[PDB]
Amino acid sequence: MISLIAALAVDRVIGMENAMPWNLPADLAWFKRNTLNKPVIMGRHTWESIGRPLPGRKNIILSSQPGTDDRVTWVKSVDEAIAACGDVPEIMVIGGGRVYEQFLPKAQKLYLTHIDAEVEGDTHFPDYEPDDWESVFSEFHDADAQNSHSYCFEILERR
């Protein structure tokens, strides 16, 4: 099973200048809980944005060029990325925009955080078709001293 996990600001913005400008510790904790002990697939730009391997997960990087760091696994196509995960129950695709576009048709589950923030961005989550997806979990949180925007954790499953 393939799943996508992402945090979306208003208008599906996910990034600006190879960064995420907001800071929501509660959402990063949600990301860690839902990805730990699973393989994570990411594109090269997202690898450079994170800047280090994510511990406790097999890190798989998509790039058309040879890898430059043997602490992670480098692959050259979507099919190779999937194969490199082996026989696991759930593969987590962690972006960015161009990777999400390619894996969306193959995904059965979306873990989406909706952040009530307006962000200028240059990268968006794919337009997906709402009729294809059933919301099976949603949990709303107001802003607090640690998290400066309200946010909604949602899990959707392909109907």
Ligand SMILES: NC(=O)c1ccc[n+]([C@@H]2O[C@H](COP(=O)([O-])OP(=O)(O)OC[C@H]3O[C@@H](n4cnc5c(N)ncnc54)[C@H](OP(=O)(O)O)[C@@H]3O)[C@@H](O)[C@H]2O)c1
């Ligand atoms: N809010 C969130 O949830 C979230 C999550 C992840 C990322 N982001 C943000 O998203 C932005 C990065 O997204 P992005 O769309 O620019 O880039 P990306 O999807 O992270 O990376 C694209 C790169 O991945 C490689 N790639 C993708 N598909 C491939 C394929 N089929 N075969 C081979 N290589 C492939 C290519 O690398 P080469 O050029 O080396 O061939 C391509 O240039 C940043 O702003 C980041 O902060 C946000």
Ligand SMILES: Nc1nc(=O)c2nc(CNc3ccc(C(=O)N[C@@H](CCC(=O)O)C(=O)O)cc3)cnc2[nH]1
């Ligand atoms: N919901 C969601 N939020 C995100 O921030 C997110 N980020 C990415 C890609 N970028 C990043 C950037 C930093 C870390 C990171 O530092 N993660 C630590 C945080 C642990 C914690 O704060 O409790 C990790 O070990 O996962 C992960 C992904 C992909 N999907 C996402 N999905």
Ligand SMILES: [Mn+2]
């Ligand atoms: Mn091929």
Ligand SMILES: [Mn+2]
């Ligand atoms: Mn197999």
Ligand SMILES: [Mn+2]
């Ligand atoms: Mn806000």
